[PDB]
Design an enzyme around this catalytic site. Sequence first.
Site, PDB file in Angstrom:
ATOM      1  N   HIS A 106       0.865  -1.182   0.000  1.00 32.57           N
ATOM      2  CA  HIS A 106       0.000   0.000   0.000  1.00 32.57           C
ATOM      3  C   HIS A 106       0.899   1.228   0.000  1.00 32.57           C
ATOM      4  O   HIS A 106       2.115   1.106   0.114  1.00 32.57           O
ATOM      5  CB  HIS A 106      -0.882   0.009   1.251  1.00 32.57           C
ATOM      6  CG  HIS A 106      -2.164  -0.747   1.022  1.00 32.57           C
ATOM      7  ND1 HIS A 106      -3.221  -0.222   0.387  1.00 32.57           N
ATOM      8  CD2 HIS A 106      -2.477  -2.049   1.414  1.00 32.57           C
ATOM      9  CE1 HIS A 106      -4.197  -1.174   0.379  1.00 32.57           C
ATOM     10  NE2 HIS A 106      -3.741  -2.304   1.005  1.00 32.57           N
ATOM     11  N   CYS A 124       0.089   2.552  -3.990  1.00 33.72           N
ATOM     12  CA  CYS A 124      -0.777   3.709  -4.234  1.00 33.72           C
ATOM     13  C   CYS A 124      -0.145   4.995  -3.757  1.00 33.72           C
ATOM     14  O   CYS A 124       0.442   5.010  -2.695  1.00 33.72           O
ATOM     15  CB  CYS A 124      -2.113   3.545  -3.514  1.00 33.72           C
ATOM     16  SG  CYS A 124      -3.145   2.290  -4.277  1.00 33.72           S
TER      17      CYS A 124
HETATM   18  C1  3NS Z   1      -2.683   0.870  -3.280  1.00 33.76           C
HETATM   19  O1  3NS Z   1      -3.123   1.087  -1.949  1.00 33.76           O
HETATM   20  C2  3NS Z   1      -3.276  -0.414  -3.869  1.00 33.76           C
HETATM   21  C3  3NS Z   1      -2.491  -0.854  -5.116  1.00 33.76           C
HETATM   22  C4  3NS Z   1      -1.245  -1.670  -4.770  1.00 33.76           C
HETATM   23  O2  3NS Z   1      -1.341  -2.828  -4.449  1.00 33.76           O
HETATM   24  O3  3NS Z   1      -0.161  -1.149  -5.007  1.00 33.76           O
HETATM   25  N1  3NS Z   1      -4.659  -0.158  -4.265  1.00 33.76           N
HETATM   26  C5  3NS Z   1      -5.641  -1.072  -4.178  1.00 33.76           C
HETATM   27  O4  3NS Z   1      -5.494  -2.218  -3.746  1.00 33.76           O
HETATM   28  C6  3NS Z   1      -6.992  -0.567  -4.714  1.00 33.76           C
HETATM   29  C7  3NS Z   1      -7.971  -1.745  -4.875  1.00 33.76           C
HETATM   30  C8  3NS Z   1      -7.895  -2.293  -6.298  1.00 33.76           C
HETATM   31  O5  3NS Z   1      -6.955  -2.057  -7.046  1.00 33.76           O
HETATM   32  N2  3NS Z   1      -9.009  -2.963  -6.640  1.00 33.76           N
HETATM   33  C9  3NS Z   1      -9.105  -3.666  -7.905  1.00 33.76           C
HETATM   34  C10 3NS Z   1     -10.523  -3.524  -8.469  1.00 33.76           C
HETATM   35  N3  3NS Z   1     -10.678  -4.193  -9.779  1.00 33.76           N
HETATM   36  C11 3NS Z   1     -11.469  -5.214 -10.151  1.00 33.76           C
HETATM   37  C12 3NS Z   1     -12.392  -5.966  -9.210  1.00 33.76           C
HETATM   38  N4  3NS Z   1     -11.314  -5.563 -11.437  1.00 33.76           N
HETATM   39  C13 3NS Z   1     -10.347  -4.727 -11.957  1.00 33.76           C
HETATM   40  C14 3NS Z   1      -9.743  -4.650 -13.181  1.00 33.76           C
HETATM   41  C15 3NS Z   1      -8.742  -3.711 -13.414  1.00 33.76           C
HETATM   42  C16 3NS Z   1      -8.335  -2.860 -12.390  1.00 33.76           C
HETATM   43  C17 3NS Z   1      -8.951  -2.939 -11.145  1.00 33.76           C
HETATM   44  C18 3NS Z   1      -9.925  -3.871 -10.903  1.00 33.76           C
HETATM   45  C19 3NS Z   1      -7.609   0.609  -3.915  1.00 33.76           C
HETATM   46  C20 3NS Z   1      -8.480   1.478  -4.842  1.00 33.76           C
HETATM   47  C21 3NS Z   1      -8.384   0.190  -2.650  1.00 33.76           C
END
Ligand code: 3NS
Lengths: 162, 88
Positions: free
Chosen positions: A102, A150
């Site tokens: 994160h 992020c």
């Molecule tokens: C940073 O805190 C992280 C990224 C990291 O691991 O470096 N952010 C997150 O984990 C986000 C959650 C996230 O990326 N969710 C993926 C959602 N999602 C789905 C279900 N299908 C997708 C296709 C392409 C891109 C994303 C997709 C944050 C926003 C909590």
Amino acid sequence: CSLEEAQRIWKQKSAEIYPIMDKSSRTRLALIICNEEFDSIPRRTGAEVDITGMTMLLQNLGYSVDVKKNLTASDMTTELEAFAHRPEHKTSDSTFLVFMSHGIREGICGKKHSEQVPDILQLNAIFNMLNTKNCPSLKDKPKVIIIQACRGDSPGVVWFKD
Amino acid sequence: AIKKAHIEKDFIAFCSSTPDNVSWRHPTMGSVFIGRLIEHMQEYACSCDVEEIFRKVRFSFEQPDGRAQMPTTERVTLTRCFYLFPGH
Ligand SMILES: *[C@@H](O)[C@H](CC(=O)O)NC(=O)[C@@H](CC(=O)NCCn1c(C)nc2ccccc21)C(C)C
């Protein structure tokens, strides 16, 4: 991973290339730090393939590649402090650091981060360990830092009218 | 016996997103930043150099999909071209 014979390259912007060292006597090194469990904030599911892909990529690219996972910002500096000293650097033409966590505005975060319990490796810090001072085997020798994390909460975007 | 060197040289950071903004990571398919990096590293590793290759992947994110993010290159102090001669 696509491959070789292009001597065009050694005759382009050359001697502004980086001098590469022969493939027989190289000890090349690369570090993956990747966090998936955190005490307080959402588990990073899918982070495995980040580790995998990157480790194969790096290896394929000519690199022995260390993985460490689930670290504090502490163990981040201390492990990274160790990556600096590894004497294989002397016979290396480069290195690849990667982090995968994160993250917040200021930095990559570690195992224990919440808003009351803060845990952050600054991008500043990554640089201050791996320079000519603290990691001297690596001067005039490229180092790339790959940060999957992020940078803050906002989605990427602005609206426009068509 | 005592000469001088630059304390900062030869770096290049590559992050997943610009400042203030988020990075995506899909459950069964990893980070969309990681995936794409890897993909580009394979094909362009020695057609091109690392500044170039890192440009390309930035390009591939440009017209926003639903889960937009623009990769950035902070703090490059590369003085020379990093060509990555895969297989030498
Ligand atoms: C940073 O805190 C992280 C990224 C990291 O691991 O470096 N952010 C997150 O984990 C986000 C959650 C996230 O990326 N969710 C993926 C959602 N999602 C789905 C279900 N299908 C997708 C296709 C392409 C891109 C994303 C997709 C944050 C926003 C909590």
